[PDB]
């Protein structure tokens, strides 16, 4: 390789999201640009919507997705991934005078991957707590899956991009999302979000697989092989964790 083009969606802060001058900026950006330094490939990141982010890779309009992507059991088997160049849970986000946030959380970390009665009956509450709870989801994600496949009966509305969801969320026109704990941090930490909080299990497994990763057409071993190095040594000499306190505000490294 000499040149590769990785995509990336521009609606995900931090990860990845628009600057001042409309420059594709973040965690994403500075991550797939010291990994291609590492690899000795040039690296162009391009800005693409997420309902075509996969098929666009898979049809060769560019080499790479690094786009808040989990790597997620329905995906892996269209893509390849690399393995995760950061881990994250999954959990529930609100108004702060909303009344969910008074609900009793009784599995504070709720993996998803072999689920006992135990854990079903925590979802269950969960479940009957938001009957009549207007929720909002970004389309084409593991958040919509989870709501549309654990939570059917919860009324859903889907929206083209996160920063839709928080829009109508801030208006009052839904009641409540689902996002990851590495969005909704950083989110609910800015002074601008006093009035947002997250709330409910932190969720890993199942439908979300674990970790974010970097996708890639499955044709194309050489080229994850490449990347697994070039995160492995990212990982090992502390840049992911310190990229992760830049954008995050916490580390999130694997
Ligand atoms: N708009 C974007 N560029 N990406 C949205 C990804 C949302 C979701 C996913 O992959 O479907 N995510 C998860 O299931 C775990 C990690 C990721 C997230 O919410 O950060």
Same mark, same amino acid.
């Given at each position: 390789?000499?040149?590769?083009?990785?995509?990336?969606?521009?609606?995900?802060? !931090?990860?990845?999201?628009?600057?001042?001058?409309?420059? @594709?900026?973040?965690?994403?950006?500075?991550?797939?640009?010291?990994?291609?330094?590492?690899?000795?490939?040039?690296?162009?990141?391009?800005?693409?919507?997420?309902?075509?982010?996969?098929?666009?890779?898979?049809?060769? &309009?560019?080499?790479?997705?690094?786009?808040?992507?989990?790597?997620?059991?329905?995906?892996?088997?269209?893509?390849? $991934? *690399? &393995? !995760?160049?950061?881990?994250? !849970?999954?959990?529930? @986000?609100?108004?702060?005078?909303?009344?969910?946030?008074?609900?009793?959380?009784?599995?504070?970390?709720?993996?998803?991957?072999?689920?006992?009665?135990?854990?079903?009956?925590? @979802?269950?509450?969960?479940?009957?707590?938001?009957?009549?709870?207007? $929720?909002?989801?970004?389309?084409?994600? +593991?958040?919509?899956?989870?709501?549309?496949? =654990?939570?059917? *009966?919860?009324?859903? +509305?889907?929206?083209?991009?996160?920063?839709?969801?928080? =829009?109508? @969320?801030?208006?009052?026109?839904?009641?409540?999302?689902?996002?990851?704990? *590495?969005?909704?941090?950083?989110? #609910?930490?800015?002074?601008?979000?006093?009035?947002?909080?997250?709330?409910?299990? &932190?969720?890993?497994?199942?439908? $979300?697989?674990?970790?974010?990763?970097?996708?890639?057409?499955?044709?194309?071993?050489?080229?994850?092989?490449? $990347?697994?190095?070039?995160?492995?040594?990212?990982?090992?000499?502390? #840049?992911?964790?310190?990229? *992760?306190?830049?954008?995050?505000?916490?580390?999130?490294? !694997?």
């Amino acid at each position: 390789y000499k040149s590769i083009t990785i995509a990336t969606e521009g609606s995900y802060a !931090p990860y990845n999201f628009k600057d001042a001058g409309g420059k @594709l900026i973040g965690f994403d950006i500075d991550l797939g640009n010291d990994l291609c330094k590492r690899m000795n490939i040039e690296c162009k990141f391009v800005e693409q919507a997420w309902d075509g982010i996969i098929p666009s890779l898979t049809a060769g &309009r560019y080499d790479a997705i690094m786009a808040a992507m989990g790597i997620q059991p329905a995906r892996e088997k269209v893509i390849a $991934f *690399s &393995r !995760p160049y950061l881990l994250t !849970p999954n959990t529930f @986000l609100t108004t702060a005078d909303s009344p969910l946030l008074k609900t009793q959380v009784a599995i504070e970390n709720l993996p998803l991957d072999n689920i006992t009665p135990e854990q079903k009956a925590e @979802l269950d509450k969960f479940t009957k707590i938001f009957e009549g709870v207007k $929720f909002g989801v970004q389309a084409g994600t +593991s958040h919509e899956a989870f709501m549309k496949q =654990m939570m059917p *009966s919860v009324q859903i +509305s889907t929206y083209d991009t996160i920063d839709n969801v928080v =829009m109508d @969320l801030k208006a009052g026109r839904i009641d409540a999302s689902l996002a990851s704990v *590495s969005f909704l941090k950083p989110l #609910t930490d800015k002074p601008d979000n006093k009035d947002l909080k997250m709330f409910g299990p &932190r969720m890993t497994g199942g439908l $979300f697989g674990k970790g974010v990763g970097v996708g890639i057409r499955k044709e194309d071993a050489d080229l994850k092989a490449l $990347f697994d190095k070039a995160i492995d040594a990212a990982i090992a000499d502390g #840049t992911v964790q310190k990229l *992760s306190q830049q954008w995050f505000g916490y580390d999130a490294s !694997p």
